[PDB]
Design a protein around this motif. Structure first.
Motif, PDB file in Angstrom:
ATOM      1  N   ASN A  39      -6.739  -5.069  -1.312  1.00 24.79           N
ATOM      2  CA  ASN A  39      -7.650  -4.451  -0.618  1.00 24.79           C
ATOM      3  C   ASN A  39      -9.067  -4.120  -1.339  1.00 24.79           C
ATOM      4  O   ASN A  39      -9.002  -4.662  -2.500  1.00 24.79           O
ATOM      5  N   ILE A  40      -9.939  -3.867  -0.813  1.00 22.45           N
ATOM      6  CA  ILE A  40     -11.267  -3.347  -1.804  1.00 22.45           C
ATOM      7  C   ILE A  40     -11.532  -1.930  -1.330  1.00 22.45           C
ATOM      8  O   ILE A  40     -11.807  -1.545   0.057  1.00 22.45           O
ATOM      9  N   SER A  41     -11.946  -1.082  -2.192  1.00 25.80           N
ATOM     10  CA  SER A  41     -12.329   0.175  -1.880  1.00 25.80           C
ATOM     11  C   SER A  41     -13.467   0.515  -2.968  1.00 25.80           C
ATOM     12  O   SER A  41     -13.138   0.571  -4.372  1.00 25.80           O
ATOM     13  N   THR A  47      -5.263  -2.000  -4.585  1.00 20.94           N
ATOM     14  CA  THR A  47      -4.010  -2.205  -3.922  1.00 20.94           C
ATOM     15  C   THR A  47      -3.878  -2.016  -2.547  1.00 20.94           C
ATOM     16  O   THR A  47      -5.225  -1.883  -2.049  1.00 20.94           O
ATOM     17  N   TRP A  48      -2.743  -2.312  -1.978  1.00 23.47           N
ATOM     18  CA  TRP A  48      -2.755  -1.998  -0.431  1.00 23.47           C
ATOM     19  C   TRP A  48      -1.301  -1.285  -0.071  1.00 23.47           C
ATOM     20  O   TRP A  48      -1.453  -0.388   0.459  1.00 23.47           O
ATOM     21  N   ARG A  84     -16.285  -5.910   6.646  1.00 26.54           N
ATOM     22  CA  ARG A  84     -16.021  -5.531   5.363  1.00 26.54           C
ATOM     23  C   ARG A  84     -16.340  -6.690   4.460  1.00 26.54           C
ATOM     24  O   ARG A  84     -17.153  -6.086   3.547  1.00 26.54           O
TER      25      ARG A  84
END
Ligand SMILES: *[C@@H]1O[C@H](CO)[C@@H](O[C@@H]2O[C@H](CO)[C@@H](O)[C@H](O)[C@H]2NC(C)=O)[C@H](O)[C@H]1NC(C)=O
Length: 361
Positions: A39-41, A47-48, A84
């Motif tokens: 993921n991207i944050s 992580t996911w 996103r």
């Protein structure tokens, strides 16, 4: 010859034998294994699943048995809004931030590369896709200065004539990526009120409204747009698409009333894992589009389009005769990884079929 194999996180939750962990991957089978969707944050890789760091660890240990095995983490996926990706790639600040956060994430978790699975960029994204790849790769090169083996960079591209022209400057990104995986298996899927096979090899002289809808055209094409064969990897399905027949028509063009019923293990309309198809096939009528070189089964009001060892070895020879870099297999976990569903007592039958062909000359 490369064999890039995707492993999906969410395949662990499947019940019964369906459950699959990195744990169950034959270390000498593929040359490159890819953990599916990080993921991207806050504009940073991340992580996911709640347990990726454990599975990451599990996967990368396979490298202790096959020191030549290589692994990569894929970014994006289908359950990841392109919006996103888009928003991150459009702002030089978001992009550079995301980028600078990748190498250390990978070094930390044992990965040898990153895989961009921006699922379908648009007309307004070409320009930035080209950037992301550029800079991303410029970072990867600036970091090998640290005295460690340079990271790999790859991208999963679509195989749809229109999708390509729309958001891909192939000529460019072809000189930055280490290799390119063509998704040659989504040339259909229920939103076509008719039956049809999603991963055919040839146009098959009989229907063209989708001449550009086959592995062959997809490759001929990429090659013309500028992508060298030594970086192209053809994608091979390990799942099948299912439809609920709307009539007693089974033959080409039959009317479809909606997707197929879910699999006892994959639970998801429209799709069936190979090992589920293996169970489906008993009491089913097997046919084969001779023109396109791919089979399809039928049972009650269920019509399934899929790939068997034949069609698969078939495509495998194809990439060879066109001198491509290698093959790509979507879902190690969708193949018969236990080797207990499909007659023959063989584990990873489909993926193996490809490996044997590539293993030759
Ligand atoms: C992937 O990361 C994104 C961004 O951090 C997460 O999306 C956030 O969801 C949080 C908590 O669920 C919300 O409060 C935010 O509104 C979300 N932001 C965005 C951009 O959606 C997302 O939940 C993460 N996904 C996974 C599987 O971990």
């Amino acid at each position: 010859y490369k064999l890039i194999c995707y492993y999906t996180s969410w395949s662990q939750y499947r019940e019964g034998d369906g459950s699959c962990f990195p744990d169950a991957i034959d270390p000498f089978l593929c040359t490159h294994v890819i953990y599916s969707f990080a993921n991207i944050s806050n504009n940073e890789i991340d992580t996911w699943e709640w347990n990726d760091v454990t599975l990451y660890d599990t996967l990368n240990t396979l490298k202790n048995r096959n020191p030549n095995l290589k692994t990569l983490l894929s970014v994006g996926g289908w359950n990841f809004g392109p919006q996103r990706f888009s928003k991150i790639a459009s702002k030089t600040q978001s992009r550079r931030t995301f980028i600078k956060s990748v190498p250390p994430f990978l070094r930390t978790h044992g990965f040898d590369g990153l895989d961009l699975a921006w699922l379908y960029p648009g007309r307004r994204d070409k320009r930035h896709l080209t950037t992301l790849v550029k800079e991303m790769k410029a970072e990867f090169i600036r970091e090998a200065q640290a005295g460690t083996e340079q990271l790999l960079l790859s991208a999963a591209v679509s195989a749809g004539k229109i999708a390509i022209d729309r958001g891909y400057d192939i000529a460019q990104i072809s000189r930055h990526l280490d290799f390119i995986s063509l998704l040659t298996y989504d040339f259909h899927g229920a939103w076509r009120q008719t039956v049809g096979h999603h991963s055919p090899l040839f146009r098959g002289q009989e229907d063209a409204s989708s001449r550009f809808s086959n592995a062959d055209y997809a490759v001929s094409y990429m090659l013309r747009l500028g992508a060298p064969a030594n970086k192209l990897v053809m994608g091979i399905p390990t799942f099948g698409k299912s439809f609920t027949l709307a009539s007693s028509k089974t033959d080409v063009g039959a009317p479809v009333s909606g997707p197929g019923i879910p699999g006892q293990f994959t639970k998801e309309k429209g799709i069936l894992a190979y090992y589920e198809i293996c169970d489906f096939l008993q009491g089913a009528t097997t046919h084969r589009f001779r023109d396109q070189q791919v089979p399809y089964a039928t049972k009650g009001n269920q019509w399934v389009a899929y790939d068997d060892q034949e069609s698969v070895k078939n495509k495998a020879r194809y990439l060879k005769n066109r001198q491509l870099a290698g093959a790509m297999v979507w879902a190690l976990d969708l193949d018969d990884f236990r080797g207990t569903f499909c007659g023959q007592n063989l584990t990873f039958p489909l993926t193996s079929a490809v490996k044997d062909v590539l293993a030759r000359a």
